[PDB]
Design a protein around this ligand. Structure first.
Ligand SMILES: O=c1ccn([C@@H]2O[C@H](COP(=O)(O)OP(=O)(O)O)[C@@H](O)[C@H]2O)c(=O)[nH]1
Length: 431
């Protein structure tokens, strides 16, 4: 087989979409080796069934308590991102030299677009280099314009809806790290003319005009949704799926703020009371390190009548379940795309980075969600949005719109669709 190496940035919203692409490629007969940091490997619980070799490299930055890589970087982003970079260059080089003593020899390196300097490692080692963007073309376009100096972080940009300042990617939320974060996002386009393959986790029908614009500059390959062995981490699948099976169609609010975002105890109390007073059934992912910010007795007693509070769920299987009526989300791109491709309308509560822009696209372009208004977002505001989605006639339109996007996404990934064709073109190029 042809041997593909894959190197995501060490965070679940970067690992998971690349894993799903790797599983598709392994189904076409390619051998896959996934490169992870030691810190990521500590959370990996299931890997045997997917058949992919996993090889680890050092973190390259300090190990603090049981914190994850981004959390450590936030202490000093400019210093620690560039320590992570130097270590990753050195140690991926060493790893590839070891892989070159085994058959089949590696031929291509698919690397996260946020790590553009890995291209030079691939080429130095005689491999093709493929940059994998884990955000949509519309948001990535903003980072390109930042690199060109057309904008620096109402705002008009080519082939994007008119934006309010609050809709631009949220870099101000990173405080003293804000300048470093803006620079790394723009750097995704710094060597794009040297990349052998440019891949985006999106599909053409979702953003026709900006994809066409981007394609007038570089040959890009839209391959999304990569999401269809589907999980590396503990998902509590049996508990979650048995509980959803006890629920009637269209009755459950799924709630998750992703793998990184953390809300204050003040904000968590507002969400807790909004869910209780709504009187709907709900499944709320509260990560284990965030549980201590919940109101006392919430997980053990008051959520027992109508809710399931869990530290991680099988999100693809949850969003596919007929009981789920809507998705209160932080609007990370994977959650946004997974919900749209499942036909599930959203309540948008973005926190930072691309989430703010994603929420504007959800509400105003794709029209499959409503957005909360900050005062802190209060229980009444959240309750209002729940009634809009679950009860009102507007909620029925949002659901019809979500089902339309689900059908276009099914088309894109099936035989003859744009993403299916693009993955075939990538695969045949390697052959
Ligand atoms: O209980 C959960 C919550 C999230 N996810 C997955 O975690 C990723 C979240 O990535 P996203 O882009 O939505 O936000 P981020 O964590 O990067 O902020 C996605 O692959 C979700 O499917 C999951 O499997 N179980």
């Amino acid at each position: 087989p042809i041997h593909i190496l894959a190197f995501p940035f060490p965070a679940k919203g970067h690992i998971n979409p690349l894993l799903h692409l790797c599983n598709r490629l392994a189904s076409k007969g390619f051998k896959i080796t996934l490169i992870t940091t030691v810190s990521t490997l500590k959370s990996v619980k299931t890997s045997k069934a997917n058949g992919i070799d996993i090889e680890s490299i050092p973190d390259g930055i300090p190990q603090e308590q049981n914190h994850q890589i981004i959390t450590v970087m936030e202490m000093n982003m400019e210093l620690y991102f560039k320590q992570f970079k130097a270590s990753a260059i050195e140690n991926t080089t060493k790893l590839i030299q070891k892989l070159k003593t085994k058959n089949p020899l590696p031929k291509v390196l698919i690397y996260d677009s946020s790590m553009p300097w890995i291209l030079e490692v691939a080429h130095e080692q005689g491999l093709l280099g493929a940059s994998f963007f884990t955000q949509p073309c519309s948001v990535s376009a903003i980072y390109y314009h930042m690199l060109q100096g057309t904008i620096k972080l109402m705002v008009s940009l080519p082939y994007l809806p008119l934006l309010e300042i609050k809709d631009l990617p949220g870099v101000q939320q990173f405080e003293d790290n804000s300048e470093a974060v803006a620079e790394l996002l723009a750097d995704q386009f710094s060597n794009i003319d040297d990349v052998d393959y440019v891949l985006f986790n999106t599909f053409d029908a979702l953003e026709i005009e900006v994809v066409n614009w981007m394609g007038s500059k570089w040959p890009i390959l839209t391959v999304g949704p990569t999401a269809p062995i589907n999980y590396l981490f503990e998902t509590n699948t049996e508990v979650c799926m048995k509980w959803l099976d006890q629920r009637e169609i269209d009755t459950v609010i799924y709630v998750s703020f992703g793998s990184l975002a953390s809300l204050t105890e003040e904000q968590m109390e507002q969400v807790s009371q909004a869910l209780i007073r709504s009187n709907c059934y709900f499944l709320w992912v509260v990560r284990e390190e965030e549980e201590n910010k919940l109101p006392k007795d919430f997980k053990e007693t008051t959520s027992k009548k109508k809710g399931l509070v869990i530290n991680w769920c099988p999100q693809l299987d949850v969003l596919a379940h007929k009981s789920v009526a809507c998705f209160m989300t932080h609007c990370g791109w994977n959650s946004t795309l997974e919900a749209l491709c499942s036909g599930v309308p959203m309540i948008c509560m973005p926190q930072w980075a691309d989430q703010t822009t994603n929420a504007k696209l959800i509400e105003h372009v794709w029209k499959i969600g409503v957005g909360v208004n900050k005062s802190i977002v209060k229980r009444e505001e959240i309750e209002d949005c729940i009634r809009q989605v679950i009860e009102s006639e507007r909620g029925k339109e949002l659901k019809r719109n979500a089902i339309k996007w689900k059908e276009l996404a099914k088309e894109a990934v099936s035989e003859g669709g744009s993403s299916c064709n693009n993955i075939q073109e990538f695969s045949s190029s390697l052959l």
